[PDB]
């Protein structure tokens, strides 16, 4: 279903990374954030929801997902929250990040290089599709 994303929080090099996975496509958005706050989650969601159609987000019960500040952003943006292939995309991202890490000074850049690669990479050879191509396809054919 074209509007469903899982959002999730993870750490590397003592920094915090917010990761959002589009479930049907495997397309990812992520960013290093300064602290694990609901405010940071809210800002991150507004950005995501302004770029893609976001209808439902799945998360866990961490306080950075259940606060007022997040709930206000979801109400404003028209996003439904649910609390409890995806654990899989998070591991793929960390592997990409590890591999490309030495091509960037800060982790924040490395993460965006990893996102670029994750979304442009092909599985199944020269003919295969990328997450980035799958998501615009899914969404494009929902508007028809």
């Amino acid at each position, epitope marked *: 279903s074209p509007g469903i994303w899982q959002l999730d929080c993870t750490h*590397l090099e003592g920094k915090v990374i917010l990761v959002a996975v589009h479930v049907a496509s495997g397309y990812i958005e992520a960013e290093v954030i300064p602290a694990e706050t609901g405010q940071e989650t809210a800002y991150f969601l507004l950005k995501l929801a302004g770029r893609w159609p976001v209808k439902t987000i799945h998360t866990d019960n961490g306080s950075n997902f259940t606060s007022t500040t997040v709930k206000a952003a979801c109400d404003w943006a028209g996003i439904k929250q649910e609390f409890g292939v995806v654990e899989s995309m998070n*591991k793929e991202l960390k592997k990409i990040i*590890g*591999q490309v890490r030495d091509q960037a000074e800060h982790l924040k850049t490395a993460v965006q290089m990893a996102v670029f690669i994750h979304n*442009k*990479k092909r599985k199944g*050879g*020269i003919g295969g599709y990328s997450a980035g191509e799958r998501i615009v396809d899914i969404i494009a054919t929902d508007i028809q």
Partner: antibody
Amino acid sequence: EVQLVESGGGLVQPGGSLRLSCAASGFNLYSYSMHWVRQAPGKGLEWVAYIYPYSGSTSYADSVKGRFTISADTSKNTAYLQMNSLRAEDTAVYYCARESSYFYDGSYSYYDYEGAMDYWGQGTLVTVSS
Amino acid sequence: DIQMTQSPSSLSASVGDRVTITCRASQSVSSAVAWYQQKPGKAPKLLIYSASSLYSGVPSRFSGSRSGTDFTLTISSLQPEDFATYYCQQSSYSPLTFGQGTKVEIKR
């Protein structure tokens, strides 16, 4: 050209212990997922364990869970498989192998390896016998 | 615990032949299948990854393909150095598992 050189294999008695190591060069082992894969004499290949040091995650085949411990020392660019409570059926050649995430074609395209293992060591023989 | 059924176990061929080896996954594993070649007393060497991408440095006569849960490794024109054993692998689900192997031996 990278490489992997395993060592620490030999003869050992049932119930015994051994510690294999896998020394890497040409690349930073911290940055990759490393696997042990073994081959019993005249049999196929069986996945044993993995570690991705950068993120700290590890994983084990069911037939070794509880007995084996994978780990890495990044100062030495080396991975280890600690093998306790050995039985006859653990007799095998043990290989370490690297799993890259992706391949970059040098000209703006990227391909996912999806768990494939690009470089393997020559292997070390572990014989478990009374 | 996903099974890769590889066939045939053994295969007889001549230099110049078109050779094919198959691997059937016991349920979808998407494109996450690799192929390796192993000569006696040597380590496995990677040939093909992600179903159909050709590993750097491997001769073009090696190719891979997928249809659903069926994977095929093809050697378009068999060379003397290709007599060996070949293995498939899936890494779509932990634990990752291997086919049981296919020995390619010389016809006479």
